[PDB]
Structure formats: structure tokens, C-alpha cells
Amino acid sequence: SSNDNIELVDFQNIMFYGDAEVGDNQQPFTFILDTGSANLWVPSVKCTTAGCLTKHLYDSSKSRTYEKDGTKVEMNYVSGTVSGFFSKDLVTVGNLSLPYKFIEVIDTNGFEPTYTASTFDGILGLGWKDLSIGSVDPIVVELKNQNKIENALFTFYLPVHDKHTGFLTIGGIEERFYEGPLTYEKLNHDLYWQITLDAHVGNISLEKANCIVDSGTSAITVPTDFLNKMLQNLDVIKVPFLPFYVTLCNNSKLPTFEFTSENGKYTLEPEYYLQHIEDVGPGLCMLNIIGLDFPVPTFILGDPFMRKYFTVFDYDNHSVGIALAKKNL
């Protein structure tokens, strides 16, 4: 066995976070563990924007293993931008440490008011090297190269609000987390943890849709066209301007998403994508789904999918393994 287990903390089934440390003195930070990006960044002690106010800040002068870099970086997410410079220091994830190149952030104006209203300190990417700024080798690939872990893979057992905690597990697959078979789907590219699946909901079908398995997206994203076709007559209301689709929690017309390959069929019933339950007035629910268009039809299988399905991210075999997550630990 062995394996490096990092506990995940849930925030109302919307978000979940995990802790890691930087510096030979292991200064603590709370992170978004993101399979959809490939850089680690923590706010520096030299950051004075309002966002930086409530955060755990990184002080390089307090760490002997720190190595100066200074190369300026502007980190642009779809969610916002943070800027700073590269630095090298010891990074500690679970019970493992390694020297690592990260971004020391000094300006978060372009990420406010989001950052100001966040509990996390930084973001820790878990994608492929080519998805990174600075050509940074993935943390997991490094640990493997350094013989600290059994395999160059990590798995996500997402926490379920109310029922249980989760775990980011580095180095090997633990059966304690799933039931039934674990089916692998080959990555179509070494960038995002993206695989090809046929997407189906009700009548609509999108053959060989690119699907990004993203721990960092808190919703299921659907191409707008496909989304337009499925909402016809469903008793699902869109609040204009805003990305909210609301519906009665008991709307019997709600469809099950179906993602299929010749290896497995993964579904997402209404109970997995309806947020709310006993809300404003009667039983209004919002769908944790939004429309989003990429150059080629893409689905982002974000947290709602991962909460149902245990996922394995395998660098050695360039694939994503999917299994039904055990309901409770």
C-alpha cells in the first residue's frame, strides 16, 4: 500500500479544499486542488492588495531551501488573474516533500472580489506539464521520478457534504474508496485530463464529445446548443443574464446525463446535479449545470461528477480510471 493521503475539506457541496505547505519550515496554505490547471501559487508576504488581507502568506526569508527565481508571471484563469514571480522552495503534500517551482503572487486585483470572498490561499494544479506556465513538471510525476511514490498517479475521493470527508491520494489506488469495476478511458491528449465519450441526455446525443475531468470546476458544463436542446419543455427556468437554471426539486421530467465509451457507461441522475432541496418558498432547486462553449463541443465533468465517481489520474498510462465512489468511509 503506502500512498500519500491528503484530506479534503467540503464546503456545502460546492467546493472542497486541501492543505499543503511551502518552505523547509512548512508554512501552511489552503488550496483549490485543480486537475484543470498545472501551476502552484501561494500569496506572498509582499502582497498588499485587499484580497491578500485574510490569507496565509508565504515568507521566503523564513525558509533555507528557498531559491530565488524572480521571473514575472501573470496567471490567467477563466475565473480571474493573479500575478507575481517564480520562486523555488520545498513543497509539502501529505507526508511527502520535494523542491518545487511555484508562483509567489503579489497582485490579486484581477481576481477580486472573488479572492476576497474565498477561504483558500492558493491554487495547486494537477494537470499535465504542457498545461503549465513555466514548463513545470507535475508534482506527482516528480515524486515518482524521486522514488517517493509507487506510481505516477493520484486519485480523488471527493467529500460529500454531510456524509463524509474526501481524500486526494498520491501514489496508488485504494479499493477502500470505490465499488464495482474501475474502467479506464484513454486520454486523448497530454494536456487536461480529457477523454472522449458519447454524451447523451434524453433525445440529444453528442458523439465523441471531449470531456475534461476537472476537480476545480464546481459544476457540470455543457455546450450551449446541447443545453438548448435539452431544456425544451423541461420545467426548467433560466434566470436571465445570470447562469442559473432553477427547477422544482421534484420535477419528474429531469433527465440523466449519460457518458459512454466501449468500456463503461457513467451516468449523472438529477440527485447528483440538483443543488438546493427545501429552498425558497417551496422546493426550488437549482441545476449545478451551466452552458459553456469551447471550439469543439466539450463537457467539463466537474465536482458533481467526481462526487458520484471515484477517479484515478494516471500519468504512466495516460488515462483516467472511473469507479463508483463508496457512499461512506
Ligand X SMILES: Cc1cccc(C)c1OCC(=O)N[C@@H](Cc1ccccc1)[C@@H](O)C[C@H](CC(C)C)NC(=O)c1ccc(N)cc1
Q: Which of 77, 85, 184, 272 binds ligand X (CB under 6 A)?
A: 77
What is the C-alpha radius of gyration for the chain, rounded to an integer number of angstroms?
Answer: 20
Q: Which of 34, 107, 121, 314 is catalytic?
A: 34
Stretch that binds ligand X, among 17-25, 76-84, 168-176, 263-271 (CB under 6 A): 76-84
- Residue appearing with cell numbers 509507487: 150
**What is the per-residue binding string for ligand X in 286-325, x denoting contact by CB under 6 A?**
----x---------x-------------------------
Contacts of residue 231, defined as CB under 8 A and 6 or more positions apart, other chains included, come to: 238, 245
Measure the CA–CA gap between 115 and 99, rounded to whole angstroms: 27
Residue 293: active-site member:
no
Pairing of strands 257-260, 265-268: antiparallel
Q: Which is nearer to ligand X, 69 or 174 (CB)?
A: 69
- ω into 243 cis (within 30 of 0): no
Q: Which of 4, 19, 89, 214 is catalytic?
A: 214
Q: Which is nearer to ligand X, 3 or 218 (CB)?
A: 218
Contacts of residue 159, defined as CB under 8 A and 6 or more positions apart, other chains included, come to: 8, 9, 10, 16, 165, 166
Residue 190: active-site member:
no
Using rule CB under 6 A, residue 219 touches ligand X: yes
Q: Which of 78, 117, 242, 280 binds ligand X (CB under 6 A)?
A: 78
Stretch that binds ligand X, among 85-93, 100-108, 127-135, 315-323 (CB under 6 A): 127-135
Q: Which residues within the stretch 32-51 sit at the binding site for ligand X (CB under 6 A)? A: 32, 34, 36-37
Alpha helices in 41-156 (DSSP H): 139-145
Residue 318, class by beta-carbon neighbours within 10 Å (0-12 exposed, 13-18 middle, 19+ buried)? middle
Stretch that binds ligand X, among 70-78, 88-96, 101-109, 172-180 (CB under 6 A): 70-78
Contacts of residue 258, defined as CB under 8 A and 6 or more positions apart, other chains included, come to: 199, 200, 201, 265, 266, 267
Stretch that binds ligand X, among 65-73, 94-102, 160-168, 215-223 (CB under 6 A): 215-223
- List of residues contacting ligand X (CB under 6 A): 32, 34, 36-37, 76-79, 123, 131-133, 212, 214, 216-219, 221, 290, 300
- Annotated active-site positions, please? 34, 214
